[PDB]
Amino acid sequence: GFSDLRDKVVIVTGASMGIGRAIAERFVDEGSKVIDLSIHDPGEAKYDHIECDVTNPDQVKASIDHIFKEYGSISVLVNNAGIESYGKIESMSMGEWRRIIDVNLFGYYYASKFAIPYMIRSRDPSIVNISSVQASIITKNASAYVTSKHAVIGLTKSIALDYAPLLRCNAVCPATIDTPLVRKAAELEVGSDPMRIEKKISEWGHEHPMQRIGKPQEVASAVAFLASREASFITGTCLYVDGGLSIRAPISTPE
Amino acid sequence: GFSDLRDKVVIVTGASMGIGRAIAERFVDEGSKVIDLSIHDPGEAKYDHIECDVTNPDQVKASIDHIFKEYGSISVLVNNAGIESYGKIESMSMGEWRRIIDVNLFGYYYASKFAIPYMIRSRDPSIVNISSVQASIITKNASAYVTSKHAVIGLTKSIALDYAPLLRCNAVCPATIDTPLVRKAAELEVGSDPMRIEKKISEWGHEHPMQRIGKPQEVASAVAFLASREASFITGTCLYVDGGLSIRAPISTPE
């Protein structure tokens, strides 16, 4: 582990499930003081939780003031809350398309905007944004999702450049990870039959050079590294946690 | 020139000045039937113009519907309309930040969403999105702008993947170009002295390996190429027109 994360105040958005939850759980294991900002209840959890809608600037600011005055500081902000729906730019309603941008992008902008003034009062604060391997190689009929993930990269670089050297800001670009959302994605394609869903997830896993999809904990490992002093000279980049997906051309060669 | 562009219907957003105007004029010179969609009147111009605010999806749709009925088709759409304001995430109001995203990203989404259905009714239609070199290397205190330009790359890949092989979609990533916006950016730093401004612009020029800033017609050449059949197997990419800016590290070496 990273001993410097102990006792540090860490905020994770959208951590009541999946990747966000594995991230919150890793920081708890690192001895940090973790606060989950999300609309859903994480139920039984080793970390604190605050009902908060990341797209509601008034709720976000208030939740961040509560954390700072209650804890005394904020060292790490992990922007993770996000969503996805499918459809061509032609069929998906404009409302649904803007909503995806609002959650996946504006939610990061709001949390970052209000947390930064408090974070820079701490020693070496760090922000980690969860993007996607789709900030590079993309999927079909995911216009809004793909756009928001590219936008997150731009926000990450600009925050990194605007606040260096006091604060660092990096992104994590995961490929297919074993989460409920990915489970839903499979289902929306092969039905509710959980065994077919397993064959589907397996097909995706085999497209990754590592021959399997990733685990939430593996994304959390990258987040913990980037948030620690071990990444002291690392800022403005995306650490790809994709089992080699982004460097693989789907073209066979003689074996 | 690119002969296949003659007589084809080409829509260019924000073509009343700068890069947009240079793009419209190049297509006119190619013999294309050009329509400018912007809020400002380009005065005496060889291309057609329709008053249109790209952040208004209803006006965008109406404008595009009208063009199709009046001209019979739409083969090329060039999304160029954009704006830039400066400020740290903490100082720029949320409204202004959001307004930059509205024009720079949603404007491209709206124009694309409504033109595509018509475009796929023509032979090998093409869309070219003007992004920026800042889709890779960025400037300070330009959070909203930088974010919007990264987002445009995502939208570009999505459209390219969603509609290939029927329609192609690419972007152009310009570095510093001689336009009113850029002259204004310099003025915001050095004042109205045409001598002190030329100095600031010459400074930026010397930062580019080509030792000068680009000309609008140079960006227009890249747009015409990508919109033409000379780029029939090119889709989903960004053609950098940056005089080498994006590949230069600002670290001296012996000489």
Next chain:
Amino acid sequence: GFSDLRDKVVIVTGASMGIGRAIAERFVDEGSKVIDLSIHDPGEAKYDHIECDVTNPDQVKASIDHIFKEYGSISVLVNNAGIESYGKIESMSMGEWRRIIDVNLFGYYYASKFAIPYMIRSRDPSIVNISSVQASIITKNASAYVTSKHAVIGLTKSIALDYAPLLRCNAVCPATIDTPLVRKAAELEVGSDPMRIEKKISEWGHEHPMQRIGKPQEVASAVAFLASREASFITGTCLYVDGGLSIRAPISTPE
């Protein structure tokens, strides 16, 4: 076409077949004075040919002096000559691995090294290096090939930076193109049966968003553009001619 290429002296290496030949043929159509530098005879061709081994620095220099003194100048150098063989870093002999680097990299370095002193005496000389989409997304068991293609990108950037603004240097990154080499690649996998080879090539084509492999002429179009004045502010980049291959993740989504 690009009227500025007329009467210009253009050198193309490895142009007795495939991509290199389509490139030579395009410049001839542009009215340029084309000279093919290759070890094989292009037979009946509308352009000049000089028996030359690109890996032989003495042969390269001599061939370039012959061209310059005979023609009076050199405006464009297209480095294309290359090769490929398959095998894990473990099985392929070291001799075969170095040979691939020698042809795909050192051959570009030699031709560039000797042509540059003559080119910079011309107005706006241009160099175009043929790399590959594998300078980004790669194939398996192609260690030496993939490495050489990444190296070509580095050589391109450095030549661009070292000689700007007098001379420009760019690369073209093609994906699967209909060439004899690609035909051989298929065969080495599915046998000599030309019909199975067709089903194989078709499978590759369908992996590209454009749903087909590229044509040599389409690569030549990109080369002609980059070599012309239309690309006057373009230097140090790679123009991807990949039908969208490099931006596509091999992950299905709900349709």
Next chain:
Amino acid sequence: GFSDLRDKVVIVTGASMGIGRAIAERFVDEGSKVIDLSIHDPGEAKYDHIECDVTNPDQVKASIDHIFKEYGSISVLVNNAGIESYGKIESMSMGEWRRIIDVNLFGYYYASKFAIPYMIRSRDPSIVNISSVQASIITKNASAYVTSKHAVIGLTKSIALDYAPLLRCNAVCPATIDTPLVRKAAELEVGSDPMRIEKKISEWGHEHPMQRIGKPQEVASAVAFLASREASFITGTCLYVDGGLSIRAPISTPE
């Protein structure tokens, strides 16, 4: 620290000084059994050393064979040995240019080629190649160096794709780091005045958003992370340790 590294056999090339020495010392601190393969003796060090010229494949193979017989396995290989000389493609002799490629690229190919067969006999082996920020943004008159660093990225992807999921392979892309090589690079520009040298180094430091150059231990932190199980789903990528250098455009904006 990364507990899984304790007791594992780690080979580091060019670990007698600078980044290489910092990497060896970090692994020693992790409890690993470290062996340095270089031509220079690291003097009194906690890690083991074997006299070895990485451009000699026979000596590399012999050294690696010996390590495996003496230690029982090899879990990590860190390719770091490298050199840098400056000069325009026209002035640097072909021999020196080629020598840079021999050490910087072939040295990595040789060490990897001979260690891999042994490495796949251990549990989750890992290779980390030290590339450079110049695999993206480059410096002038560093043709061979820049070319070699791009090539290293290609070799890295290939190894990653060829041996996944058994073995992982990633690279680290360091910007300016405080090492003897860098101090020497500065001296080549400003002389031996420790005051004038510190000035040159401070100049380079201010070019990085972090406002300082990196420390060798910071590069070592990234290497240890990638070599550990904390990066089990990370392969084929380059982790940039550049203090933000690669995402900064050298163009001023109002403030």
